[PDB]
Design a protein around this ligand. Structure first.
Ligand SMILES: OC[C@H](CC1CCC1)Nc1ncnc2[nH]ccc12
Ligand SMILES: [Cl-]
Length: 167
């Protein structure tokens, strides 16, 4: 039993809800919130900009130190950093950004990072401003993640479309 509420169950382990991930994380304070990161951990827009804003820029400060020490992530890769006031940990995961010409096949590799954590709150990787088809992202999620994932989707028409089209 966990404290996630109001989710539709899609499979044994994948759940979905129309929600603002910032407001969800503040309520649940999950062990792991997933950020839709880029390789530079520059949290400007989309989910990343919203999560960072909610931390009063502390996420960006921590991220800049991480990059200065370690260099950029790989597309498809991840790192674990603090969750600040939102969660215990933030798993920064880099899905391919189609608006940059990155290979969509890397989306499966990106979702594989979720399997290192028993329970996660997360957005659909490569959706929104990353320019991929969200129906595809949900399909890859369901077919790749084996741990318990609670997907937040900050758009009603999209959410309704994702539910009604889910196979
Ligand atoms: O990338 C996945 C979705 C895509 C957008 C919804 C339609 C375009 N983004 C988000 N999902 C959940 N919570 C969020 N908070 C701020 C942004 C955000
Ligand atoms: Cl987005």
């Amino acid at each position: 039993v966990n404290s996630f509420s109001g989710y539709l169950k899609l499979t044994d382990n994948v759940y979905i809800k129309n929600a603002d991930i910032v407001e969800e994380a503040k309520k649940v304070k999950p062990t792991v919130v997933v950020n839709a990161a880029n390789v530079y951990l520059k949290h400007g827009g989309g989910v990343a900009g919203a999560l960072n804003k909610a931390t009063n820029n502390a996420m960006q400060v921590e991220s800049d130190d991480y990059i200065a020490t370690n260099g950029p992530l790989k597309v498809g890769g991840s790192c674990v950093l603090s969750g600040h006031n939102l969660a215990k940990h933030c798993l920064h995961v880099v899905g391919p950004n189609v608006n940059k010409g990155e290979d969509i096949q890397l989306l499966k590799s990106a979702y594989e990072n979720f399997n290192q954590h028993e329970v996660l709150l997360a957005p659909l990787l490569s959706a929104g401003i990353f320019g991929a088809d969200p129906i595809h992202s949900l399909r890859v999620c369901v077919d790749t993640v084996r741990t318990n994932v609670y997907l937040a989707v900050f758009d009603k028409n999209l959410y309704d479309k994702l539910v009604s089209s889910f196979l």
